[PDB]
């Protein structure tokens, strides 16, 4: 039996992609960069804050100092944070609160393995903090594309190996990260996106304890 579930945040617990998009678009427009549209935001799925900014600058072949780069990232984050101030418990994705309750009821550890430094704030806004035995801090581990480090950190923060854990993710890069950690991925979304040889559910209403248990047993030799 798995000992922990490692939760992604965006696309699993809730999704703030619309606010990330609007904050990036506002930053781009402020510096005279056109072309940050909704489809462009698709290109940022599984992409870090810094790598996202770099893609936007690349749109306009815009060159900046390392220091200016840091300031631009901070600017976007400030705007993003303003926008997520209105997140509430009503923004919790379907099935997620019940899953957290069922995991807690069965003494299965719950860890956050979000790439976002805004994870703790978002859990507080959703009244979910106390369900989480640990929050892995993305500032303290690798943020490169598909890096397993956040999932490894999340498992370790609740006293388990990734091999004893399930990881939930909405992005191709995050699924890859989970695989590389040694945890068992269960993706939410479309296979065309998430990849092959994993269990994929179409929406979070399918993330039930019963289903996670069935999948675990299917994937054990
Ligand atoms: O891994 P999650 O919870 O889906 O969060 C993904 C988000 O994390 C980031 O990589 C970093 O988020 P922050 O800018 O809030 O620190 C975003 O670019 C991305 O949209
Ligand atoms: Mg996500
Ligand atoms: Mg993630
Ligand atoms: Mg269904």
Author numbering: 1 to 221
How is this structure described in the published paper?
Allomorphy is a post-translational fine control mechanism where the catalytic rate is governed by a conformational switch that shifts the enzyme population between forms with different activities. β-Phosphoglucomutase (βPGM) uses allomorphy in the catalysis of isomerisation of β-glucose 1-phosphate to glucose 6-phosphate via β-glucose 1,6-bisphosphate. The active site of βPGM is located in a cleft formed between the cap domain (T16–V87) and the core domain (M1–D15, S88–K221), and these domains reorient in response to the binding of a phosphodianion group in the distal region of the active site30. Substrate-free βPGM exists as two distinct conformers with different activities due to cis-trans isomerisation of the K145-P146 peptide bond on the multi-second timescale. Allomorphic control of βPGM involves the isomerisation of the K145-P146 peptide bond situated within an allomorphic control loop, which leads to either fully active cis-P βPGM or partially active trans-P βPGM.
Addition of 100-fold excess F16BP to substrate-free trans-A βPGMD10N,P146A in standard NMR buffer immediately produced two discrete βPGMD10N,P146A:F16BP species in slow exchange. The dominant population (72%) was assigned as the trans-A βPGMD10N,P146A:F16BP:MgT complex (BMRB 51986), in accord with the crystallisation experiments. The second species was assigned as a trans-A βPGMD10N,P146A:F16BP complex (BMRB 51987) without MgT. From the populations measured and the concentration of Mg2+ (5 mM), the MgT dissociation constant was estimated as Kd (MgT) ~ 2 mM. Both complexes adopt a NAC I conformation. In contrast, the sidechain of K145 is in a solvent exposed position and a water molecule now occupies the vacated alkylammonium cation site. An additional magnesium ion (MgT) is coordinated between this water molecule and Mgcat, providing charge complementarity in the neighbourhood of the 6-phosphate group of F16BP. Again, further closure towards a NAC III conformation appears to be obstructed by steric clashes between the carbonyl group of V47 and both the axial 2-hydroxyl group and equatorial 3-hydroxyl group of F16BP. Overall, these results indicate that NAC I conformations are preferred for F16BP complexes irrespective of the isomerisation state of the K145-X146 peptide bond. A consistent feature revealed by both βG16BP and F16BP complexes of βPGM variants that populate a trans K145-X146 peptide bond is the ability of a magnesium ion (MgT) to bind, albeit weakly, in place of the alkylammonium group of K145 in the active site. The observation of MgT in the same site within the trans-A βPGMD10N,P146A:βG16BP:MgT complex, the trans-P βPGMD10N:F16BP:MgT complex and the trans-A βPGMD10N,P146A:F16BP:MgT complex indicates that its accommodation is correlated with a trans K145-X146 peptide bond.
